[PDB]
Amino acid sequence: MRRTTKETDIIVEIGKKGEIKTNDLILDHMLTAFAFYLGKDMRITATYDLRHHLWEDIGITLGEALRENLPEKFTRFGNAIMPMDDALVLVSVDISNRPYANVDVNIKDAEEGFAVSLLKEFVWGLARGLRATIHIKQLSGENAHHIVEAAFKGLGMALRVATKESERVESTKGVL
Amino acid sequence: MRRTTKETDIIVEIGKKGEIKTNDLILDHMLTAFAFYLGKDMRITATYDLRHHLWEDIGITLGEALRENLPEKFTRFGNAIMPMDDALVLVSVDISNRPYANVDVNIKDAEEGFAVSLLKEFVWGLARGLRATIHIKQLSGENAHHIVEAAFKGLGMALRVATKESERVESTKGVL
Amino acid sequence: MRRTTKETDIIVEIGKKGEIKTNDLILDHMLTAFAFYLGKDMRITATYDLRHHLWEDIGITLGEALRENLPEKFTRFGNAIMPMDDALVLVSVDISNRPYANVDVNIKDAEEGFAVSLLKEFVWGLARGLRATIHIKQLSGENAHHIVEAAFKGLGMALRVATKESERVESTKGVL
Amino acid sequence: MRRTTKETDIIVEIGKKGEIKTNDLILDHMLTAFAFYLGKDMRITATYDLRHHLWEDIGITLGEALRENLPEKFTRFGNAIMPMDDALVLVSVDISNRPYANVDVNIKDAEEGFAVSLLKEFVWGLARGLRATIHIKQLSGENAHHIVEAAFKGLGMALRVATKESERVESTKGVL
Amino acid sequence: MRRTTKETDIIVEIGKKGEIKTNDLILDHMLTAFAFYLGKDMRITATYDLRHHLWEDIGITLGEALRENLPEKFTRFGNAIMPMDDALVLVSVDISNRPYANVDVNIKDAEEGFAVSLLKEFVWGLARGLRATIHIKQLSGENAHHIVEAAFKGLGMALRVATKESERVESTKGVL
Amino acid sequence: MRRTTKETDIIVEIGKKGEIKTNDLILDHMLTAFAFYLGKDMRITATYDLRHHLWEDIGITLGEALRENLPEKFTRFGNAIMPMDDALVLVSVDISNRPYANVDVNIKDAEEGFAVSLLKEFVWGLARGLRATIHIKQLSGENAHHIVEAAFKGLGMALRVATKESERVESTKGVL
Numbered sequence A, B, C, D, E, F: 001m002r003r004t005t006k007e008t009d010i011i012v013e014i015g016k017k018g019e020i021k022t023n024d025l026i027l028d029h030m031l032t033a034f035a036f037y038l039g040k041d042m043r044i045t046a047t048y049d050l051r052h053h054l055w056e057d058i059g060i061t062l063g064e065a066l067r068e069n070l071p072e073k074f075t076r077f078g079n080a081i082m083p084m085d086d087a088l089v090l091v092s093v094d095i096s097n098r099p100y101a102n103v104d105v106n107i108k109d110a111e112e113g114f115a116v117s118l119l120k121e122f123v124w125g126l127a128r129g130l131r132a133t134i135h136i137k138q139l140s141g142e143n144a145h146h147i148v149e150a151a152f153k154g155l156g157m158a159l160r161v162a163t164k165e166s167e168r169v170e171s172t173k174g175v176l
C-alpha cells in the first residue's frame, strides 16, 4: 500500500520481511512493537516534511493496508490490556466501518520524541484508514515511553484478534 | 423455557432458529445483539403489561433457560470489553450460584426507549434466573444506545465463554 | 443513493423533486430545512426500526449522496451562523476526507422528539458518509427546537458553499 | 519586498511563482498554507539567526509586501472561520492603519516546532507591517498543529477578502 | 418614513442623499456607521425629549423604513463579524417576522455617551420596526466606543446581506 | 523449590499433588485459589515467625518456582478480570525480567486475617522471585475477602496464560 502527497510518501507492505525505516527513530520503535504484537512481518518506508504529517499518514496508510489485507469475514473485535512497568493501557478495537478514536492518556514524566499530539494523530489516521473504532485508555502509569509503547503493543495485540478470519459477517445488521 | 404470571408470558428457547418478538422494539434489538454475540440461535416471544415487567421477566426466563442448558461442568467465568463508537463497556460474569448484579453506567445523551431502570432490571433478572454474579461497568461513553447495546453485546460475549463445558467443577470449595 | 441494512432502508436522491418522508416527523422537518438551505430538491424515503438507526443512517446515506454529487474540484470549506429566535448556532464544514464531528449544544428547554443523541448521530453519520470535518457550536440559546433546527439550516447553508465547484484541488498537499 | 537587519534577511515577492524557503520547515508549511488560501503565488526566501527573529521579521516583511500590493481603494475587512479536525479558529482582519494583534489560543497537545511565542510574533509582525487590526480567536481545539495551521489558513482567507479592490475608501472618517 | 409621538419626531429616508442629524452626536456617528456599512445613503432627522426615547424610536423608525423598502422576496439572513481594535463583535440578523433582540456585550472601559441601555433600546426598536431577530454577541473587547461602533458597523453589514432580493420566499413554511 | 532463612522455611513444589499448609489459614486459602486458577497441583509447606515474613517469602519462593518451570520461550503476558460478588479486580502480568508491583485496592469492609500489607508483600515477593511486572487494580468492591481472593484467583488465571510455551522470544529487543 502506497500513499503519496506533497508532504509524505509512505509504503506499507504487510507480510513482507523487510525494514521499518521512517526516518523517525521513535516511530520506528513504536511500529516495530506494533508489528511484533500483531504477529506479522511488514516493510515500512517513509519520507516526510514534518513529524505530525508522518505519524498521521503512517496511521492512514497502515490502516488502508490492514483493510486491504482483511478476509471477507473477519472477527471485527479485539482488545488488549498491556502493562509496561508503571504503565497499564487498555486498547479496544472494533473494525466497525465507523471511524472514531478516543485516546485518553495521562503522561506525568514526559520524554523527548513522545508526544500525545503524535500518538493521537497516528491513532486517528489508523481509525480513518482501516475504518474502525479505536479506544486507548490508560488505566495506570506515569512514564511517557512506557505509556505510548504499551499503547502500540496493545494495538498490535488487539488487531491480531480483530483481523482474524471469521465464519460470518460479525454484525446483527447484516453488513459493515 | 416458559414463565407465566398475571403480568407477563414469556418463552425462551435456546438453540431453536426463530423470531425474537417481545412487542418492545428496543428489547428485541438488545436481545438480537445478546444472542448474536452469545453465538446461539434463539426463539423468544413475550406478552406483557408494563415494560419493566417485560425486561425483568425476560432476564429471569433467559437466565433460567441458560441455566437449564449448562453442562454439568462449565467454565463459570467470562468477560468482555465492548466498544460502540464513544461507548466502552466491561461485562464480567461468574456463574457462581450467588445472585448479584452491579450495573454502573453514566448516560450523558439519553435516548427514548433506553432507560437505566430497564437495563438494571433485565440484568438483575438474568442474575437471579441464571444464579450468577454480573458486573456491567462503563469505562467510557455518552450515548445511551451505544452504552446499553455494548452491554448486551458484552453479556453475550461473556456468557459465550462462561457457559462452555469444562473438565472440572470450577470451584476450590468443590461445589457451586 | 439507496442504503439497506437489516435495521433501515433509506433512499436519498439529491436534485429530484419529491417528498421527504422518513416516518419521523421531526426528522422530516429537519431534513426539509437542510435541503432548503442547501438549495436543492431532494427525495428522501425511509423505513426503520429504531429512531437512532434512522437518524444515523440518514446521515450516512445523505453524506454518501453529497459525496457522489461533488464536483471533481470543490470549494471544500463552508460556514454558517444561523439564528432562530433565542438560538444562535455556528456550523463549520471542511470536506477534508477526515471524518470528524464535534457537536456542542446546550439545551435548556427540552422538547419531545428533539434529542442530542439523535442530532449527534445524524452529524457523525453525515461526517462519515461525506468524509468530512463538521463542527456545530452553539453560541446562544435555550429552546431545543430552535437550536436543532438552526443546526440543520446551518448545515444546509454551509454545505451549499462547500460543495460548489472550484478551479483547483483545495489542499496544499495536492490530494483530498 | 526586502528587509535586511543584522539578524535576518528576508525577501517576499507577491505574484511571482517561486519557492517558500525560510530554513524553518514549520514556517515554510505555514506560509505555504497562508499563500494558498490568500490565492496568490509568492516567492519567499530568508536567512536568520534565531527562529523568533525569523517569524517576526517574516510577518513584518509579508505585511509590508501586502501593503505595497494593495489597490488605492480596498475592501479593508475580511474574516475566516477555519476548521482543522478538532481545531476551529476565527480570524478577523481590519486593514485599519491601527496596528493591533490579539491572539487567543489554547493548545492542549503541544507539538515540536509549534509555539505560541512564534505565532504571536508573526501575527504582531504582520499587523505592524501591513498596519492592520488582527484577531485570532480559537473557538475549539486541542492539537497545536491543527490550531496554528487553521490560523494561517484563516489569515490567508481573511486577507483574500480584505485586500480586494473596492469602489470607495472604506471609512466613514474619509481616510485610513 | 416619519414617526411622531409626544416624545419624539423622527424622519428616516433611505436612498436619499442627506444629513444624519438627531441632536445626539454619539447616535449621529453610530447611524453614519450603520448607513455606510449598509451601503445606502440616508437622510435622518430627529427631535426628542430624552435620549432613550430617541435611540429606541430611531430604531423603530429605521426598522419600519427598512421593512417598507424590502423586495417581496428577500435574502432574510445576514451576518457580520466586525473588529475595532480590541473589540470583536458578531451581529446576526434574520428578517423573520418574529421580533427578538439579544444584546450580549461586556464593556470594561466605559465612555460618556455610550450606554448599554441605549444600545439595547435601539436594537429592540430596530427588531420591532423591521420585525426581525437580531443578535449582537461580543466575542472580544474592552472599550465602549469600539464595542458599540463595531455593533453598528456589523448591523449595517448584516442588513446589507439580509435585505437583498432573493428568487424565493426564504422559509420552508412558505410564508414569513 | 526450598528457601530457608532464619525467619522462614518454605517449600513450593509445582506440579506435585500435595497439600498447601503454611500455618496461616488465610494464606492457605489464597494459595489454594491461586493454584486452582493457575491450573496446577502444588505442594506448599512453611514454617515462619511473623506473618509478613511468611507472605513475602511465599511470594518470593513461588515466583522462583514459577521461573524455574517456565519454558525457554514463553507467552510472557497474561491478564485476568475476576469478579467475586461485589469485587471486580483486574490482574495484569508481564514476565518482563523487570521486577515491579502496583497493588491498588480499596477495602471498605475489613476482615480479620486480610491485610493490604500482607497482600502487597506477597505480590512484591512474587514480582521479585519471578522477575515480573504485576498490576492488581480494583475496579469495584467493598469486602476484604472478596477483593483479596479475587486478586489471587486473578493472579492464577493471568499466570496460566503468561507461563504457556510460545514459538518465539516475546520481545522486540530479542532478550528477556
Ligand SMILES: O=P(O)(O)C[C@@H](O)Cn1cncn1
Binding pocket: A170, A171, A172, A173, B084, B145, B146, B149, C052, C053, C056
Ligand atoms: O453496527 P453494529 O453491528 O455495531 C449494530 C448497530 O445496531 C450498532 N449501533 C450503532 N449505533 C446504534 N446502534
Ligand SMILES: O=P(O)(O)C[C@@H](O)Cn1cncn1
Binding pocket: B170, B171, B172, B173, F084, F145, F146, F149
Ligand atoms: O465459591 P468460590 O469458588 O468463588 C470460593 C469461595 O471461597 C469464594 N468466597 C466467597 N465468599 C468468600 N469466599
Ligand SMILES: O=P(O)(O)C[C@@H](O)Cn1cncn1
Binding pocket: A052, A053, A056, C170, C171, C172, C173, D084, D145, D146, D149
Ligand atoms: O489536508 P490539508 O489540506 O488540510 C493540509 C494538511 O497539512 C493539514 N494537516 C492535518 N494534520 C496536520 N496538518
Ligand SMILES: O=P(O)(O)C[C@@H](O)Cn1cncn1
Binding pocket: D170, D171, D172, D173, E084, E145, E146, E149
Ligand atoms: O476609522 P474607522 O473607519 O474604523 C471609524 C472610527 O470612528 C472608528 N473609531 C476608532 N476609535 C473610535 N472610533
Ligand SMILES: O=P(O)(O)C[C@@H](O)Cn1cncn1
Binding pocket: C084, C145, C146, C149, E170, E171, E172, E173
Ligand atoms: O419560520 P422559519 O422559516 O424559520 C421555519 C420554522 O419551522 C422555524 N421555527 C420557529 N419555531 C419553531 N420552528
Ligand SMILES: O=P(O)(O)C[C@@H](O)Cn1cncn1
Binding pocket: A084, A145, A146, A149, F170, F171, F172, F173
Ligand atoms: O523489553 P520490552 O520487550 O518490553 C521492549 C522495550 O523497548 C520496552 N521498554 C522498556 N522501557 C522502555 N522501552
Ligand SMILES: [Mn+2]
Binding pocket: A052, A056, A121, D085, D146
Ligand atoms: Mn493532523
Ligand SMILES: [Mn+2]
Binding pocket: A029, A145, A149
Ligand atoms: Mn522501548
Ligand SMILES: [Mn+2]
Binding pocket: B052, B056, B121
Ligand atoms: Mn423489578
Ligand SMILES: [Mn+2]
Binding pocket: B029, B145, B149, C053
Ligand atoms: Mn443499535
Ligand SMILES: [Mn+2]
Binding pocket: B085, B146, C052, C056, C121
Ligand atoms: Mn450510533
Ligand SMILES: [Mn+2]
Binding pocket: C029, C145, C149
Ligand atoms: Mn420548526
Ligand SMILES: [Mn+2]
Binding pocket: D052, D056, D121
Ligand atoms: Mn519579538
Ligand SMILES: [Mn+2]
Binding pocket: A053, D029, D145, D149
Ligand atoms: Mn499540516
Ligand SMILES: [Mn+2]
Binding pocket: E052, E056, E121
Ligand atoms: Mn424603552
Ligand SMILES: [Mn+2]
Binding pocket: E029, E145, E149
Ligand atoms: Mn468612532
